[PDB]
Each structure stands twice: as structure tokens, then as C-alpha cells.
């Protein structure tokens, strides 16, 4: 029924690849909208992630209230970053 195998159509050129890390998974699965939020941070040397799975709520827009974001991991690499793209997974027709 459900294996969730994925195909990497994101890159082609595995060249000069420097650092590897394996982490624990970030998302887990709850009837309403569990908002999942992340903060990508650019500090000199280190890049911190600040995450929350909210509890279940029904706001079509942004909800109100306060959410405290916790530091998970900083990443000691230290490069310039000017842009961003995300990545999605879909069985899309041709």
C-alpha cells in the first residue's frame, strides 16, 4: 500500500562535496492544521534552525498567539548564501 520511496531529480552534479551529516527526522504525524514552522538563520560560521509543530487549529490565515521556537542545531560551515529554493515531493504527470 504505502512505501514512500523518493527519487532525486533535484541535483545532477555531485562535485567537490564537503560535509555530510545525518540527523533525526524533523516532521512527524492531528486532524486540523498543525502548522509547522522553521527559521533559517545566517550567522557567521553557524546556521541555526528554530522549529515548532503547533497543535491543531483551524485558521485559514496565520493564527494568533505566541509560539516559542527552540534551537536545534547550528551548522559550522560558514558560506555566503544569497538565495533560497525549497523542495517538494510529488507523483506529477508528464
Amino acid at each position, epitope marked *: 500500500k504505502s512505501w514512500m520511496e523518493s*527519487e532525486f*531529480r533535484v541535483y545532477s552534479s555531485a562535485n567537490n562535496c564537503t560535509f555530510e551529516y545525518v540527523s533525526q527526522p524533523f516532521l512527524m504525524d492531528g486532524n486540523f492544521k498543525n502548522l509547522r514552522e522553521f527559521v533559517f538563520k545566517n550567522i557567521d560560521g553557524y546556521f541555526k534552525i528554530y522549529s515548532k509543530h503547533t497543535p491543531i487549529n483551524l485558521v485559514r490565515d496565520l493564527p494568533q498567539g505566541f509560539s516559542a521556537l527552540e534551537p536545534l542545531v547550528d551548522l559550522p560551515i560558514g558560506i555566503n548564501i544569497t538565495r533560497f529554493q525549497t523542495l517538494l515531493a510529488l507523483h506529477r504527470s*508528464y
Partner: antibody, heavy 119, light 107 residues
């Protein structure tokens, strides 16, 4: 029933160019991807080429990569081929198979266009 | 990609038609299709999604496709059965279509 008019067939010298056209009729041309299946007689069928409904990407059979550009245009309502520098593998019957995403079936098969070389 | 593990010839004449059986590991990923090769050289779709028949089909049973193989839509022996069958499966996502070589059904 709607139908496909595939053409361009005939004989050619090996290793030089030949175009294989396939007019579409009766349906909308701007919603369906078209395939091409080559089959030398005496053996089995083999898909060779496909593009999108608008031709956004050009995806081919893996043996015959890079030699052939295929193109559509929605005003002319045809898809044609071009056979640059074959190695006498195109002694084959070439079909137009309509494909409409029922997880990639082949709806309306063509009549079959022959290319065979005189070597 | 891999060619579909097919029969090349099922020469068959009891009243029951014996089981044409084509298989493969990408058939586990996405369900496989079947196409004939009729004399007159018009291939037709005979079973799609292994449950439901096309419009204008010769009226038969359907596919079942139990596991890694496909058991298909054949009935008892008629006069149109000598047109053979061809396997068809798409791959996972890299848009490839494989065939095997075709069967052969013979009374």
C-alpha cells in the same frame, strides 16, 4: 471517433536526416502528450520519444539519446520528428499513441509509419 | 530499463484459455497495462488499471494482477484470439515504457 494522421514515412539513406510527421485531429492538441513507438517487424514494440502537452521537456528512449529533437506546435496541430545520423536501427514501424494520464496508458494507436534504409 | 518477464508464445486450445502471465518488479510500483497486436497492425488497449474494461472492448472478464505478475482478462476460446498480447508498464518517475517481446496465442 477522433483520429491521428501520421505521415512522413518512406525510404532514406542511412546516417542522414528524415522527418516523420503526425497530424492530430478531432481533439484538443493543447492538453495531451503524444508518444512514439518504434517496432522493427519480427520483434517487439519499443517506445522511442515523448514530449509534454506543450512540449516543455523532451524525453526519449535511453539508447537513442541526443540524436533526435522532436517538436510540436499547437497552430499546426502536428508533431514531427527528425532522424539525424541513424546507425540502421530504424528499419521500424513508427506509431502515434495518444496518451491521456490514466497513469500513462496509450489510448489511440496510429496506423504506423515505416522507415527502412537501403543499405 | 528491464524487459518485462513475459511468455513469448502460449499456443492454447482447450475450452479454457490458459494463463498468460507477465511480471516484473516495477509492476509492484505502478500497475501494468496490456496491448494487443492485431493483424491489420492496430494495437488496442485491452485492460487498464487491472480492474476496468475500455469502451468498445470485446466483452470479457477483467484483469486481476495478483502480486508481481498479471493475470488478465481472457475468456474461453473465440475466433479473435489469435491476435497476441504485449506487456506494458511505466516505471516509477523517470518516464520509461517497457514491453517485453509480445506473446503469441495460437489455437
Amino acid at each position: 471517433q477522433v483520429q491521428l494522421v501520421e505521415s512522413g514515412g518512406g525510404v532514406v539513406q542511412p546516417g542522414r536526416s528524415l522527418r516523420l510527421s503526425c497530424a492530430a485531429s478531432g481533439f484538443t492538441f493543447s492538453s495531451y502528450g503524444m508518444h512514439w513507438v518504434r517496432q522493427a517487424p519480427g520483434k517487439g514494440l519499443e517506445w522511442v520519444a515523448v514530449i509534454w502537452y506543450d512540449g516543455s521537456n523532451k524525453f526519449y528512449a535511453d539508447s537513442v539519446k541526443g540524436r533526435f529533437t522532436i517538436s510540436r506546435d499547437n497552430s499546426k496541430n502536428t508533431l514531427y520528428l527528425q532522424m539525424t545520423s541513424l546507425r540502421a536501427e530504424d528499419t521500424a514501424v513508427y506509431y502515434c499513441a495518444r496518451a491521456d494520464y490514466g497513469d500513462f496508458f496509450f489510448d489511440y494507436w496510429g496506423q504506423g509509419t515505416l522507415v527502412t534504409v537501403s543499405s | 530499463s528491464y524487459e518485462l518477464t513475459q511468455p513469448p508464445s502460449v499456443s492454447v486450445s482447450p475450452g479454457q484459455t490458459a494463463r498468460i502471465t507477465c511480471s516484473g518488479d516495477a509492476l509492484s510500483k505502478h500497475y501494468g497495462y496490456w496491448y494487443q497486436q492485431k493483424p491489420g497492425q492496430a494495437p488496442v488497449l485491452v485492460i487498464f488499471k487491472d480492474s476496468e474494461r475500455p469502451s468498445g472492448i470485446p466483452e470479457r472478464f477483467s484483469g486481476s494482477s495478483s502480486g508481481t505478475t498479471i493475470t488478465l482478462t481472457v475468456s474461453g476460446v473465440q475466433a479473435e484470439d489469435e491476435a497476441d498480447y504485449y506487456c506494458q508498464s511505466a516505471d516509477s518517475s523517470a518516464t520509461y515504457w517497457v514491453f517485453g517481446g509480445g506473446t503469441k496465442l495460437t489455437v
